[PDB]
Every structure is written in structure tokens, then in C-alpha cells.
């Protein structure tokens, strides 16, 4: 006869930083139409601007104007709000 166990461990995890130390890589942050009387695509370059349509999308970032279908297409990333 011979026998036995025991074990008991824990940890709290949640938060954590979503930041690297290489080159963090940030998307481009499509704002629903809002696009100027002049805008322009920066995929296709095409005649841009959704008057009474609310509908295309610009970054608010590097400010750059897109179609629906041309995001998509859109490759590049994006830097950012700000930076220095
Ligand atoms: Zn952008
Ligand atoms: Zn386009």
C-alpha cells in the first residue's frame, strides 16, 4: 500500500500590453463618409466624396480617402495619430 497527490497553484492575468519594441504596426482608421468637396482615392485615384451619402471612407490618421470596395485593396499600413 502506497499512495499520494498534491498540487495547488493560481495566477490573475488580464491586461496585457498590446506594444512591441520592433515596429509596432497600427491599422488605418476608416471614418464612414466625411470626405471633403475635393477629396480623391489614394487606392485608384478616383473623384472622391459622399456629398449626401455618408459612405466613403477616410483615415483620420494619415488622412487618407478610399472606396468601399478599394480599402480592401488597400495594402499599405498605416503610421499613426501621431508620433513624435
Ligand atoms: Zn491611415
Ligand atoms: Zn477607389
Redesign the pocket.
Known amino acids: 500500500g502506497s499512495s499520494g497527490s498534491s498540487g495547488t497553484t493560481l495566477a490573475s492575468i488580464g491586461k496585457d500590453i498590446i506594444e512591441d519594441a520592433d515596429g509596432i504596426a497600427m491599422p488605418?482608421?476608416w471614418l464612414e463618409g466625411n470626405l471633403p468637396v475635393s477629396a480623391k482615392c489614394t487606392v485608384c485615384d478616383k473623384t472622391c466624396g459622399s456629398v449626401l451619402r455618408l459612405q466613403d471612407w477616410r483615415?483620420l490618421?494619415?488622412?487618407?480617402m478610399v472606396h468601399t470596395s478599394c480599402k480592401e485593396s488597400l495594402l499599405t499600413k498605416?503610421?499613426g495619430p501621431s508620433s513624435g
Open positions: 488605418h482608421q483615415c490618421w494619415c488622412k487618407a498605416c503610421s
